[PDB]
Amino acid sequence: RRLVIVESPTKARKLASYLGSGYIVESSRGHIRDLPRAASDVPAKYKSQPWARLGVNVDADFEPLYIISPEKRSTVSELRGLLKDVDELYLATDGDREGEAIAWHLLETLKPRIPVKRMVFHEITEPAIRAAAEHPRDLDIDLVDAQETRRILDRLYGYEVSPVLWKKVAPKLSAGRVQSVATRIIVARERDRMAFRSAAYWDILAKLDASVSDPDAAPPTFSARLTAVAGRRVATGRDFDSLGTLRKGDEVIVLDEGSATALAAGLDGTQLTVASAEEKPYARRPYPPFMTSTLQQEASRKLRFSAERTMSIAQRLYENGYITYMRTDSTTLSESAINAARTQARQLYGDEYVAPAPRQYTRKVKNAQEAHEAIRPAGETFATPDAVRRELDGPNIDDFRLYELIWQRTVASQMADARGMTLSLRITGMSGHQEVVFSATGRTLTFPGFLKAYVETVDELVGGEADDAERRLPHLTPGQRLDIVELTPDGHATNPPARYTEASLVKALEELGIGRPSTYSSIIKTIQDRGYVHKKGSALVPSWVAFAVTGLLEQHFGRLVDYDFTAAMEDELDEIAAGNERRTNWLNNFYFGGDHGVPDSVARSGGLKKLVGINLEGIDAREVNSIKLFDDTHGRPIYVRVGKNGPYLERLVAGDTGEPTPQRANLSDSITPDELTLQVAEELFAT
Incomplete structure (x- = not known):
């Protein structure tokens, strides 16, 4: 008989159906050992070690104290009993560093005296499982070292950073390194929306008929937008910066309602001329x-x-x-x-x-x-x-x-490949004594190709055109006359940058090099569970506590939430996993400081321990839990205070016998941060 260990009962039953007679397949229920989670987890033999509760001996090359989770105690003893009656042990955990570490813990805990085979597979079929049992892989200690380094990093980070969060923000907040970076991503975007100022800009939307000069044109009518007036390009939304003032680029003309309406009036009565029409094939892979x-x-x-x-x-x-x-x-x-x-x-x-x-x-x-x-x-x-x-x-x-x-x-x-045409148009006219230019764009899908089987969905908040969408335009030739069906002066405003969806946050975590396949969803899950982020529809919205924690980390521990420093630490963990960096060297440098790593990183700044142990009596907790919004119309700052009972608005005003007296108005999650305008604040301050 042969004992096979996997992480889960579903996997255990599935492998057993493929291995057949002569195998006993059992489940470990995931990890069987962890660092101590409470004082009572420390065994008697280690209670004489002052570092045992932390679980890491930083003075002896970060030696860990692994103990058996009391919830897994019976699992281990049952596994131990079965091992006594088999001739071979097969470890069939996942092949990545998490599963390799679980197999390593099983070896360390069970101490087999019989042959051990480590099975690796990436699908669960009868061929894949059979091949894996017959061709085991040597245990990869570099993977185990990478998993262990991250486990200890997480323990030390929590050990050093948690008490700062407790003393300066709130008790019962939990530290999370990568979680705090993802939370900063969400907070930064919300701060960008709050500081965004819209600009107004007008153009003209025209519906143009071609069936006068060509009764075969399909479609007969189409739309086009004014884009130049007397040789100066018409301002669009991309031409304004986030404060609503024009970018320092080429010159543009910013039309307004009266401006754009006068151009349309000097136009209706006239016809337009196709100045240019271009077809360009595309092929989509x-x-x-x-x-x-x-x-x-x-x-x-x-x-x-x-x-x-x-x-x-x-x-x-x-x-x-x-x-x-x-x-x-x-x-x-x-x-x-x-x-x-x-x-x-x-x-x-x-x-x-x-x-x-x-x-x-x-x-x-x-x-x-x-x-x-x-x-x-x-x-x-x-x-x-x-x-x-x-x-x-x-x-x-x-x-x-x-x-x-x-x-x-x-x-x-x-x-x-999908195939089609990209379609361009230049249309000229005369509004009084000024030449106008109208532009229309199109795109056909001659042959859908793979789009018949899969089309990606556009992000709900970013918007855009699907890859199979069509905008058809009739066939036109330069000089061709066009009749104006309708002219509508059309007003617009720039929009704040879109919030993240879970989809675009995953994308950002990947592109910044901060997420990994095994962490994307747990990052996103955890920032929501610990109260940092909530969903409004599909949008991720930071809570006010998220602002307080992010500002604290940014203002006083900035290296710990820097995107580039975080991505580089993830890369270094992967280098440990490949055997090009040593677990012990990495931990010593990170925690105690050293000469290795990206310039100005935590390691190169003197290490996590020195970094966090600055003088904290110089970090005012009142300031940490105050998020500045704006001043009111009298010049008085209004700020959100994060208190033990939640968030509230506050300003200092003149009281009964002289100022400064606080005025407050309580707040709920109903109002997203970028929605709490001065107008809203003033309404909250009255009722």
């Missing part, structure tokens, strides 16, 4: 197969799933053998998957829609031990969407809908 980042984005935009929901569903699909492993930065497809996807594309859409050659989407992954393939349907032959629809019906419907998304993306990635 398919989207790459999903990796974790793009799966979460598209599930969020198309399916409206939170990042956390997406990864819970993806985990069930994985453990049940429907898809490949869902924590990956690879968009590579294996040979059988490319061929299955081409076949499906051929059967569902026709030979014309299959790409002529197989399409490989190879990008360099951080660590080839940890990611082998895109997220795609499992198996040499993909399970059909209908068969999966019948199995995951009823309560498992979200599972089907994510599988369908993955299936369609995988098939579309092997399909032919």
Whole structure:
């Protein structure tokens, strides 16, 4: 008999069905050991060590104290009992550094005296599981070191930074390093919206008829926008800065209502002339197969799933053998998957829609031990969407809908390019003695290609045109007459920068190099649970406490929330995982200071311990929990105060017998920060 250990019961039952007689497959319920979480976790033998409760001996090369979580105590003893009756132990945790560390803890805890085989696989099928059992991988201690370094980093960061949050913001706040950076991202955007000032600008929208000079033109009518007047380009929204004043670029003319209306009046009665018309072909390549980042984005935009929901569903699909492993930065497809996807594309859409050659989407992954393939349907032959629809019906419907998304993306990635035309137009006229220029743009989809099988969804808050959208224009030739159906002077205002959705936050975490496949959703989940961020529709909105904590970190511990320093620490952890940096050297440099790392980083500034242990009696807690908004019409500053009972507005005013007396008005989450205007503040201060 052979004992096999995996992380979860679903995985345990699934591997057992494939390994057959002679294997006992059991679940570890995840991690079995952790650093001490309370004083009572410290065993008697270590109670004589003053560092035991922290769980890390920083003076002995950061030696950890791993103890068995009391909730996992019976799991360990049951595992120990089964080990006594087998001839071989198989460790079948996930192949990334998290799963490697779990296997390492199982070895350290069970101390086997029998052969050990470490199985690695990235899909759960009978071929994949059989191959893995027959070709085990040597235990990768570099992965384990990378996982352990991050665990200790997290412990030390919390140890040093938490008491500053307790003394200067609020008790029972928890420290979170990467979480505080993601929260800063959200706060920075909200601060940009509050400081945004709109500018007004006008143009003219024209509906133009071509069926007078060409009764075959299709469509007969179309719209065009005024874009130049007497050789000066007409100002648009991109021409104003965030304070509503013109950028320092080429000269423009800023039209207003009376301005634009006078141009339309001097025009109606006349006809317009096609000065120029251009056709330019385009060819769009398919989207790459999903990796974790793009799966979460598209599930969020198309399916409206939170990042956390997406990864819970993806985990069930994985453990049940429907898809490949869902924590990956690879968009590579294996040979059988490319061929299955081409076949499906051929059967569902026709030979014309299959790409002529197989399409490989190879990008360099951080660590080839940890990611082998895109997220795609499992198996040499993909399970059909209908068969999966019948199995995951009823309560498992979200599972089907994510599988369908993955299936369609995988098939579309092997399909032919989309083709169409980009269409341009210049239209001239005469409004009195001034030459006007009207511009129209278009785009056709001659051949949809892969778009027949997958079209990305535009971010709800950023907006935009879908990749399959069309704007058709009739065929025109220079000099051609056009009749003005309608002239509408049209007023506009610049808009503040859009809030993040969960989808665009994942995108920003990836592009800044701060997130990783195994952390994107837990980051986003955690900032919402700990109260830093909430959802208004699909928009992530920071809470007022998020402003207070972010300002504290920015003003006094800025290196800890710097985007570039954070991305570089993530890279260094990956270097440990590849065996190009040492766990112990990295921890010593980071915590105690050293000569290695990016210039001016925490390590190079003297280390985390010196950095946080500045003189804190010089950090005023009243200032930390005051968020300046604006002054009122009398010059008095209005500020949001974050108090034990929540947020409230406050200003100092003149009282009964002289000033300064506080005036307050309580606040709820109902009003987003950029909505609390002076007008709103004054209304709150009265009622």
